[PDB]
Design a protein around this nucleic acid. Structure first.
Ligand code: MG
Ligand code: MG
Ligand code: MG
Ligand code: MG
Ligand code: MG
Ligand code: MG
Ligand code: MG
Ligand code: MG
Ligand code: MG
Ligand code: MG
Ligand code: MG
Ligand code: MG
Ligand code: MG
Ligand code: MG
Ligand code: MG
Ligand code: MG
Ligand code: MG
Ligand code: MG
Ligand code: MG
Ligand code: MG
Ligand code: MG
Ligand code: MG
Ligand code: MG
Ligand code: MG
Ligand code: MG
Ligand code: MG
Ligand code: MG
Ligand code: MG
Ligand code: MG
Ligand code: MG
Ligand code: MG
Ligand code: MG
Ligand code: MG
Ligand code: ZN
Lengths: 129, 83, 141, 149, 101
RNA sequence: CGGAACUGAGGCCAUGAUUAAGAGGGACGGCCGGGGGCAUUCGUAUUGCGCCGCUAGAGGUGAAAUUCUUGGACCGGCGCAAGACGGACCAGAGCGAAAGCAUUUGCCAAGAAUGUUUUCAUUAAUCAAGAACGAAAGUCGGAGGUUCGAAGACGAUCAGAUACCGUCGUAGUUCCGACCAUAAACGAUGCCGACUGGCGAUGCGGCGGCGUUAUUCCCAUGACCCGCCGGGCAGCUUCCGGGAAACCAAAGUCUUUGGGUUCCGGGGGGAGUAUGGUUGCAAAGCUGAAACUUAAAGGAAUUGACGGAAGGGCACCACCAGGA
RNA sequence: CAGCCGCGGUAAUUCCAGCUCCAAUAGCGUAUAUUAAAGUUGCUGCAGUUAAAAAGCUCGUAGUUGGAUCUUGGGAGCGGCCGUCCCCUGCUCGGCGCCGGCCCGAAGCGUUUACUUUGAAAAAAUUAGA
RNA sequence: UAGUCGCCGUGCCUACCAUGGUGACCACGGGUGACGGGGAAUCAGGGUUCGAUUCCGGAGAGGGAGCCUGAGAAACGGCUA
RNA sequence: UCAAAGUUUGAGCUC
């Protein structure tokens, strides 16, 4: 059965961005997804999406720009100590200059660099660059 | 076309999609005010009745069920009510 | 892997534990039949007595009469065709003399022409065969 | 996809977004309940009730017009059956199968379908055991089953 | 390598079919793979009817026909030279030629 | 006046129950289909018999004989007979878990798919152990024994043929009742779930829409006709991208590598052998090693060479027509 | 001779010698176990149409994984529309004490795990390291 | 349950009752060229193998067993088979 | 509208 909503959505967008598609409809609306989009949006990687409320699991329409090479997921949700954060971000990213690993925490949903400022380890969700 | 207003599809479109696949889920069934010329009162038939809807006072029959929409008896008017 | 579950450590480890045995080399190391069957028994050298001199013929394209020698080990009693290498060294090897034997760099595998001969002679009577071939030392008589 | 078959049919009811009642409908929940009482007394399932109401009285859903649902109302008045109607219909089906096989011993397909049916029964039975509607000692037993319809 | 997509047959949804005995041989071929020819033909073809038409009594009296349906086996077909070999590329052209012959 | 159990009737609490999933089960409506089982009906041909007619060969092959035949063969007509088989209609069509499933009629129950503002509200997906089914041959009993036909014999060619050709012909081939579980059981492609190009055709259910055409006298049905919808067997198509290539809208969404879960492979041989264990009346199935030897084994595609494979074209050291 | 490919059948760049030349240098050679190299056991990281490979099919308890839904925000002051510092429990004895009441301090009680951060606690030797 | 012994708690031992406990989360049984650990070698990151060996803990002095003496021994450079 | 057609010094091919 459908286990991971986010896991289906993020593939759908990467198969859009490869084709240069302009706006994308995603069928199951989750709160975690919503937090994820708002994280990338405040930092400027995409435009203004809008969510279609049905007294139900909503839908979401993303107006896509063209700056996103990939937006990936890590299943299963691994715990991540501050020891392993460097090895993860090394092996999981293009470079030491750019690209991000987004992990939700007790503190809240935020980037790994913000986790470095706040002194907060946690559970890896995914990444993008 | 690349650009496609997914938020703003036309009514002709939302009619020519699948029952779930419209931008929002909506049914294709309806209720209707069925009436013979003789009897006074009007019945409130569901379009997919799966029932023999007898008239008021057991005067005479109107529907005989089929696959989809019910076929009405010879000479029986109706009016699709709305809300 | 295929089960990328968070709690399948056991299932994974078990599978690995079964499949290591299908690797031919691990099985080679950990079952004893190879170590026991090997007359060397995990050793570099082994002493033994010469009992006869044999001219084994070479394999194809090549064509040669390789000079081997049937030794019998003391500790087990097993019999070996230890090959003497170089030019004119066989006249030195007298019968009923102790020679230290080594391998041939292949870990249980035949080498080229000499069919089934994994062993070569190093010494004769506390005298290096090299020293005899070079002419540094002499045989004690 | 379906559980014990290869079909993957997508056909079901699709309720609309408005949970509001229409303007033309003026039949109260109390009147509907008095109808419920008569029909339950006469002997009828929640399904067939919901069908008739939508067909003649033109009221598609009670849950939407009134607040609570039909089965919970019946449970309040003590009309609910000893066990759920779907299990009722399955054992009745099961019995007819074993009956037809009794003469017709060859029907192998009938045996295959029977066995899948029983698997489906015990699946539902464990759900209802967790939902705390059956007692722990309940057990389908082809010997005792035919007593139950 | 995969030589043909359909394995010289027409078995896509089904699964089994009844075998036939060859006419020239008796080779067992699956009916669906087997070649099927519906040959209707005049008991007298063309040269014979002109000759035989002399033998008829009535001026222009129609001849009945010989309604055959033949099936051959493969090696017989190439031997009897009904079908020729084709190239790898032309192989996919599965349209038969028009009705010139 | 304080602290434990028990027991009567209050006032107030906004008084108490998350939605109904393009998750799932169950119900309903008319359909649909070589879907299954049992019983029932029909057809020719077949080989056999009985009878009648003329008659000397019939058979069979590349060419012949054993074979049947003037004690009437073969051929034709009319009757009878038993068991196979249900042609042609039959499709790049349908249904079934899979093998597979097609003479008429009747009985029994089921189910995928469709329409649905039907009920319950997480009941679900995949799975060692365990279980049901599982073409042909094989085996054990009966029943039945028409055809073909392992085995076998003989007759033919042939250097040999204990084969390919022929005449006979046993077990088997048919039904019921008992075992068995193996095929290239192939799409050689595990199951669910999502997303990313078209194009026409088709099968089912459903919906809509000028007009033709039967019911005939309209309606509402039937056959055409033009469309839309769901999933379904297939087809074509392209610089989507992948892939060693052959190829695939999947064998894609991979060094930009993690949606879920089973099974299973790690040089060739030795060897699916041995030993052990288990099943089976037997046949055999299943689990399943080592020694020793050995440097290569294979796949796709290119150019040759060959071809008792086909298509084209030429030559009196080819033929054809002939000559020394 | 040659770990392997291969060399040697009368001008041998491959043998035995001489003549030279190379690497390393008081050290080098040979053998065996073993490790990286091995994305040839792969969790990070392999394969499974045709190179070796998917149980003939379906059922099935443990095993493994499982839709959505409940707290979002608020007050005072601060820096260059933006960010941050200050704050977001409740229910017997005395003083910031003030004119029996109010607050605070203290004692006891708190529906429950995984997860994450601190400290203590860690035998030395060893390792890194001032 | 009640005692014995023992410095105390306990099938440690004795007697009388009850009939329990473990198991696909691999027990039970068999193997181990296994004393354990602190560590060493190797390495990109993950890991792999080794570790009798000068510090700690255990066990042992031909094989097994038994004991006096002593605060402390089932001692072996103390005894009896 | 299908009877058959076997072999070839050991005495030296090749980037
Ligand atoms: Mg399943
Ligand atoms: Mg027939
Ligand atoms: Mg088959
Ligand atoms: Mg199993
Ligand atoms: Mg059979
Ligand atoms: Mg059989
Ligand atoms: Mg038998
Ligand atoms: Mg025959
Ligand atoms: Mg003969
Ligand atoms: Mg024959
Ligand atoms: Mg098979
Ligand atoms: Mg991979
Ligand atoms: Mg092998
Ligand atoms: Mg070799
Ligand atoms: Mg000539
Ligand atoms: Mg000529
Ligand atoms: Mg030299
Ligand atoms: Mg590596
Ligand atoms: Mg290694
Ligand atoms: Mg192969
Ligand atoms: Mg293969
Ligand atoms: Mg399979
Ligand atoms: Mg297979
Ligand atoms: Mg969820
Ligand atoms: Mg340490
Ligand atoms: Mg120590
Ligand atoms: Mg210790
Ligand atoms: Mg000791
Ligand atoms: Mg002692
Ligand atoms: Mg001394
Ligand atoms: Mg001592
Ligand atoms: Mg021949
Ligand atoms: Mg020769
Ligand atoms: Zn043929």
């Amino acid at each position: 059965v459908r286990m991971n909503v986010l896991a289906d959505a993020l593939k759908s967008i990467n198969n859009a961005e490869k084709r240069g598609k302009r706006q994308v409809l995603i069928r199951p609306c989750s709160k975690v997804i919503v937090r994820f989009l708002t994280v990338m949006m405040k930092h400027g990687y995409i435009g203004e999406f809008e969510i279609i409320d049905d007294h139900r699991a909503g839908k979401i329409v993303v107006n896509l720009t063209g700056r996103l090479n990939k937006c990936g997921v890590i299943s299963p949700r691994f715990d991540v100590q501050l020891k392993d954060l460097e090895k993860w971000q090394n092996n999981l990213l293009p470079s030491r200059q750019f690209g991000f690993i987004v992990l939700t925490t007790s503190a809240g949903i935020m980037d790994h660099e913000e986790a470095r400022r706040k002194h907060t380890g946690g559970k890896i969700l995914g990444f993008f660059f | 076309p690349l650009a496609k207003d997914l938020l703003h599809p036309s009514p002709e479109e939302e009619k020519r999609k699948h029952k779930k696949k419209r931008l929002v889920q909506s049914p294709n069934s309806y209720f209707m005010d069925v009436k013979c010329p003789g009897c006074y009162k009007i019945t409130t038939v569901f379009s997919h009745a799966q029932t023999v809807v007898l008239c008021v006072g057991c005067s005479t029959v109107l529907c005989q069920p089929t696959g989809g929409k019910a076929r009405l008896t010879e000479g029986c008017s109706f009016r699709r009510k709305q809300h | 892997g295929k089960c990328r579950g968070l709690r399948t450590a056991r299932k994974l480890r078990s599978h690995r534990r079964d499949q290591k045995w299908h690797d031919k080399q691990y099985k080679k190391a950990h079952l004893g039949t190879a170590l026991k069957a090997n007359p060397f028994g995990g050793a570099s050298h082994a002493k033994g007595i010469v009992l006869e001199k044999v001219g084994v013929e070479a394999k194809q394209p090549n064509s040669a009469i390789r000079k081997c020698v049937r030794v019998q080990l003391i500790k087990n009693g097993k019999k070996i065709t230890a090959f003497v290498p170089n030019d004119g060294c066989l006249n030195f090897i007298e019968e009923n003399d102790e020679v230290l034997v080594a391998g041939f760099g292949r870990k249980g595998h035949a080498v080229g022409d000499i069919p089934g001969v994994r062993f070569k002679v190093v010494k004769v009577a506390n005298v290096s065969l090299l020293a005899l071939y070079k002419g540094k030392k002499e045989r004690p008589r | 996809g379906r559980m014990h078959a290869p079909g993957k049919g997508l056909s079901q009811s699709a309720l609309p977004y408005r949970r509001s009642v229409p303007t033309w409908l003026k039949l109260t929940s109390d009147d509907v309940k008095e109808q419920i009482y008569k029909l339950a007394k006469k002997g009828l399932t929640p399904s067939q009730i919901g069908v008739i109401l939508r067909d003649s009285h033109g009221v598609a859903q009670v849950r939407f017009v009134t607040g609570n649902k039909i089965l919970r109302i019946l449970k309040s008045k003590g009309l609910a059956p000893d066990l759920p109607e779907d299990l009722y219909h399955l054992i009745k089906k099961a019995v007819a199968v074993r009956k037809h096989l009794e003469r017709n011993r060859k029907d192998k397909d009938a045996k295959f379908r029977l066995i899948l049916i029983e698997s489906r029964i015990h699946r539902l039975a464990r759900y209802y055991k967790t939902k705390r509607v059956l007692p722990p000692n309940w057990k389908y037993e082809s010997s005792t089953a035919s007593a139950l319809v | 390598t995969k030589k043909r997509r359909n394995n010289g047959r027409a078995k896509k949804g089904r699964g089994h079919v009844q075998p036939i005995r060859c006419t020239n041989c008796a080779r067992c071929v699956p009916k669906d793979k087997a070649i099927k020819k519906f040959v209707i033909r005049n008991i007298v073809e063309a040269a014979a009817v002109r000759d035989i038409s002399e033998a008829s009594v009535f001026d222009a009296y129609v001849l009945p026909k010989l309604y055959v349906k033949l099936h051959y086996c493969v090696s017989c077909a190439i031997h009897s030279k009904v079908v020729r070999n084709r190239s790898r590329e032309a192989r996919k052209d599965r349209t038969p030629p028009p009705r010139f012959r």
